[PDB]
Amino acid sequence: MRYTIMVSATASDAAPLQFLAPYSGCAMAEYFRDTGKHGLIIYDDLSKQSVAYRQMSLLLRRPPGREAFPG
Amino acid sequence: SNQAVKQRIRAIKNIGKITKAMKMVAASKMKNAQIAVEQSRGLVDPFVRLFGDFPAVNSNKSVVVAVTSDKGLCGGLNSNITKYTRATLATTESEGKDVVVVSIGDKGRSQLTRIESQRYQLAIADTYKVRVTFGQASLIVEELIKHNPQSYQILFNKFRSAISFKPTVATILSPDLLEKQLEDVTGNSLDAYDIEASHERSDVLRDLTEFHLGVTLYNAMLENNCSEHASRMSAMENSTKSAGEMLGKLTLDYNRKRQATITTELIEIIAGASALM
């Protein structure tokens, strides 16, 4: 943990928080990309982030495509 | 296109129960033919200790018999001894001899013509349809003595267990066309025996090698028939796996199409409702 940031949007959190959490963590890791250091970002279940975003798009009544995911 | 994938699961599920029926059809036929192949193994033993075993002789004329199956879900059994035919039919020719190639079993004429069609002269089939008897194997032997070679070659699969079928070459020399001519070294190996026949020793050996031909032919097409059921059993096991692996990939493909057509029909319904509301 001396070198790790842990960004957590769990299964009970709101779907916009789970949708935003990989962008939140990428922005924290882009601090090290932008200052000459090196980052390592892990998006654990990016398949769970698309399901959270599918929830927000269907609740916004946007038209679903293949497997009811948005375009 | 959701019925084409559903009718293929109709096919592979019926195949995977056909081929599991043929697995145990061949399994029960392997066991009641093992009680006939062990009783028949005795009579080949005195003729190989009386006359010995001489595969590589320089015969002038030979009759080679590759005894195969009639039905062909065997799994490369009828091809392995067609392969072992030319492995011995190129080996024992060191002088340019006559060879008559014979096949017992209907799957032999279709594969021996592919290698030797100019030496293939006889085709015995329909052998195992009722059973294999010695009188039947006698008549097959008497048709082989119409041609008189100096040697006979019988190529068959020896049923060792349900797993291993090591093929055998069993050789029968004609009675003094080569047979006593191979024992007579510094005397004779056959002259130890006191002949109790009606006529001459050269005449009883004429009787004795036809009987040695009919015995090792009766064993050959009884060893091979029990080796055929035990390779169909291993072939029909490998095809129920292949029809279970294919059925598993089709059911994953069907569930994906089942989920996709429920999503597709629902998106069509909501789009038609949102166009009105």
- Where helices occur in chain A by DSSP H, the ranges are 15-34, 47-59
How many Cα neighbours within 13 Å face the side chain of A21? 24
The answer to whether residues B37 and B19 belong to one domain is no
Strands B61-67 and B98-104: parallel
* Whether residue B81 is found in the same domain as residue B212: yes
Q: Are residues B85 and B113 in the same domain?
A: yes
Experimental method: cryo-EM
How many residue pairs bridge chain A and chain B with CB atoms within 8 Å of each other? 10
Q: B225 and B95 in one domain?
A: yes
Which residues on neighbouring strands pair with residue B61, listed in sequence order?
Answer: B98
Q: Measured between alpha carbons, how far is B1 from A49 in angstroms, rounded to an integer?
A: 32
Let me know the angle formed at the C-alpha of B255 by B252 and B258, rounded to the nearest 5 degrees. Answer: 150
Beta B151-159 vs B61-67: how paired, if at all?
parallel
Q: Where do runs of H (alpha helix) occur along chain B?
A: 4-31, 34-37, 44-50, 77-89, 109-112, 134-144, 180-183, 201-274
> At a CB cut-off of 8 Å and minimum separation 6, what does B247 contact?
B9, B12, B13, B16
Cα→Cα distances B270→A68, B274, B276, Å? 12, 6, 10
Tell me which chain A residues have a C-beta less than 8 angstroms from the C-beta of B271: 63
Which element (helix H / strand E) includes B65?
Answer: strand B61-67
Cβ-based neighbour number of residue B101 at 10 Å: 25
Same domain, B114 and B168: yes
B103 touches B122 (CB < 8 A): yes
**Which residues 31-70 in chain A show a CB within 8 A of chain B?**
61, 63-65, 67-68
Q: Are residues B55 and B138 in the same domain?
A: yes
**Domain of B267, in residue numbers:** 1-24+236-277
Q: What count of other Cβ atoms lies within 10 Å of the Cβ of residue B122? A: 17
* Chain centre distance of CA B46: 25
B276 and B152 within one domain: no
Whose tokens are 């015969």? That residue is B59
Q: Are residues B149 and B244 in the same domain?
A: no
Closest CA to B121 of B142, B141, B99: B99
B194 in the same domain as B107: yes
Total structural domains in chain B?
Answer: 2
Across the interface, whether the CB atoms of B267 and A68 are under 8 A apart is answered yes
What is the distance between the alpha carbons of residues B75 and B231, in angstroms, rounded to a whole number?
Answer: 6
Cα(B162)–Cα(B56) distance, rounded to whole angstroms? 30
Cα B22 to Cα B75: distance, rounded to the nearest angstrom: 13
